Write a protein that binds this ligand. Structure first.
Ligand code: HEM
Ligand code: HEM
Ligand SMILES: Nc1ncnc2[nH]cnc12
Ligand SMILES: Nc1ncnc2[nH]cnc12
Lengths: 379, 375
């Protein structure tokens, strides 16, 4: 038979039809990823939340040689604490007001130049960069170069491409350099890392690998989610009116946008460490399982009228940060990051709308996120 | 009815235009507005429309004529003296300076880099800022308005006018700066209104639509030039071995380039027999440059970049009355860029398979969204 292809659609302003048809007809389906390998696409909420919590489905092993891949790869010590005190909003008391300031300078720059403007280049991208620069404790001077490296880092490619490794070691280098500076870094994950290799009980390259992969994962995540948040806010201006009128609903509203957003454009991958029956399908050890977040978060068995943005849902047990052992360790930084972004957004640009019909946004191909290459708006 | 636009993928000639030219060099097509149009796709018939004044360009912007996409005095002296090769004695060395900083910046950081944001875009803005005598300070804002100005839409869209009047406003400001502008088309403009024998609106209009057309035409072309050099390294080796062949190369590259994503529009004023087709007065005629510049009747083995062609009378700069008044600048801008490129990054190559470059939709030009290269 002909197998379904994965990924589904770079267009992210409606749920792809295919996601719905899969979850309905075959919530576990053998699909053909872009590398040519075959994997199992889990597209319903019950079975998705199962794979994320069942630890016989491993993440680490997706990086092993010769296991099947959805796309080619592009890349222990008590460091955990340094990470987790970096990822608590309660370990940077100043974070919230600073981000509020960041978001307002960016927006005031745009207001002074006047509409239209690209909200990716002029807002989501410098903003997502500034937060992660603070998280690492590096200056926001090279944010364009840094976000540019992300443009290569999270390319999704059928085969391995040179330049992914050159790009890796290029920014690996930049990180190692911020870390070994002559006024040695205090402040930030890097500041926490310097203190760490002075204590008496880990390589600089390993240290930089963490700061990099962290700066990469969160910037690309929060900038993509923020653009999808914004497109929602422009297409459905009633939602902005809701926030201007009722500032307190910002968190629940971000919570729904998280569920509704189509910024994730790969699936969450796992390798089966043992035969498991999942649904009506015997999955064999060593096969690949791809957890399709939008399939789960649009599942009508758990969320009524999933196609409709709704801030007043009784219950919202969505999977936008994943589940299980590998849940996002920055869920709240993400959440905080977006709430402040958007509260500022609706105060400053209350007339916010797209500069042209939605159908004519350019959706980026070949990337880990679905995102519009430019986000032109009016206000 | 066949459909126009042809393809957003600009790394080969769209197989369709080859079928069109071979079978119907003047075929009726369906534009994205849903209007109907005559697509002229062979060299001889393309040249015919471009030199037959009865095929009008101005009347393409007329109300309620058919459209391929939504619309978005003593001045001749000021313009042509700004676009003339021998009118900025230092322009050449300054461009090479720009080219060299931009490339040196990228060598400092290391590969990979994006030659669009990092090279073609600033370079093209730098040239046109100087052309207008304004600082390059806000080139990103300037270039970002190009991103909206030259969108190709089925219907009109609120945001082409706001974007126009936003950037019109910027040019008026530069013009009316209290340290009045000396130098540049703008410095040529202040002088024009202190003469004894034309409004501030129209004056910024000209300066804007010039910065518009030139920066977008030259940045998109340049990136196609680069893609060519990266994919066919032997061509770089040639420009290093024989630097003087840069002129011929920019000419072949111009013939070969696919940056132009629309066709050139005209409105027939009277009925004309063009080819075997009777075009009625008031119908729309779209000249497809890529069809003509790849016509094998005129260019032997058109698919193959050739720096050593005996003759190369291409139409990359148009033809006829409306031939690009800046061909020479264009050529100079491209020659300097590419000389600097093969000397600075001699290993220049794409970071990833060409088939994966993201080609921009819905724009007057075909361009990669990013142009990642290694060296
Ligand atoms: C709104 C933005 C965000 C979204 C939508 C998001 C969502 C996710 C999801 C779904 C995963 C995949 C884990 C899995 O395979 O189950 C993940 C993991 C991860 N992301 Fe996020 N995240 C966001 C914010 C951030 C931020 C701000 C950072 C960086 C500081 C970050 C760091 C990480 C890390 C380190 C992991 C790996 C977790 C593990 O393997 O244990 N992300 N995030
Ligand atoms: C990369 C180089 C360039 C290319 C490929 C190019 C090519 C063309 C083409 C094909 C046309 C259309 C002619 C027609 O409709 O018949 C044109 C005209 C024009 N372009 Fe370019 N050009 C380039 C650079 C420039 C520059 C640097 C400027 C000026 C700043 C410029 C300004 C214009 C103007 C004003 C026209 C209209 C001519 C008229 O209506 O009389 N372009 N160009
Ligand atoms: N590879 C990935 N896929 C989806 N969401 C992510 N968030 C962080 N990394 C991710
Ligand atoms: N609208 C346009 N179409 C094609 N080539 C151009 N060069 C400058 N403007 C152009």
């Amino acid at each position: 038979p002909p197998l379904p292809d994965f990924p589904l659609s770079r267009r992210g302003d409606i749920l792809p039809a295919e996601a719905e048809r899969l979850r309905a007809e075959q919530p576990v389906a053998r699909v053909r990823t872009m590398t040519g390998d075959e994997a199992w696409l889990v597209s319903s909420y019950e079975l998705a939340k199962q794979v994320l919590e069942d630890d016989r489905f491993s993440l680490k092993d997706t990086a092993n040689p010769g296991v099947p891949r959805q796309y080619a790869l592009t890349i222990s010590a008590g460091l955990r604490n340094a990470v987790m005190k970096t990822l608590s909003p309660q370990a940077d008391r100043e974070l919230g007001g600073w981000l509020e300031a960041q978001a307002h300078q960016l927006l005031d720059r745009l207001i002074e130049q006047g509409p239209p403007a690209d909200l990716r280049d002029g807002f989501t991208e410098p903003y997502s960069a500034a937060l992660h620069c603070r998280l690492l404790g590096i200056p926001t001077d090279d944010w364009r170069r840094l976000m540019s490296g992300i443009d290569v880092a999270f390319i999704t490619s059928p085969r391995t491409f040179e330049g992914s490794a050159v790009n890796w070691y290029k920014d690996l280098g930049y990180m190692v350099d911020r870390l070994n500076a002559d006024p040695e870094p205090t402040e930030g994950l890097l500041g926490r890392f310097a203190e760490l290799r002075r204590s008496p009980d880990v390589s600089d390259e390993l240290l930089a690998t963490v700061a990099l992969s962290l700066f990469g994962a969160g910037a690309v995540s929060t900038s993509a989610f923020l653009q999808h948040a914004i497109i929602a806010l422009a297409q459905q201006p009633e939602l902005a009116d809701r926030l201007r009128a009722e500032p307190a609903v910002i968190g629940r509203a971000v919570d729904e946008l998280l569920r509704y957003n189509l910024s994730i454009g790969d699936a969450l991958p796992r390798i089966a460490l043992a035969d498991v029956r999942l649904g009506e399908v015997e999955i064999r050890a060593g096969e690949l399982v791809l957890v399709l977040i939008e399939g789960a978060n649009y599942d009508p068995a758990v969320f009524p009228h999933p196609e409709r943005i709704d801030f007043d849902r009784e219950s919202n047990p969505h999977l936008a940060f994943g589940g299980g052992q590998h849940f996002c360790p920055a869920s709240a930084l993400g959440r905080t990051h977006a709430e402040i972004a958007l509260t500022a957004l609706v105060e400053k640009l209350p007339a916010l709308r797209l500069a042209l019909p939605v159908e004519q946004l350019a959706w980026r191909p070949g990337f880990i996120k679905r995102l519009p290459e430019r986000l032109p708006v009016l206000w």
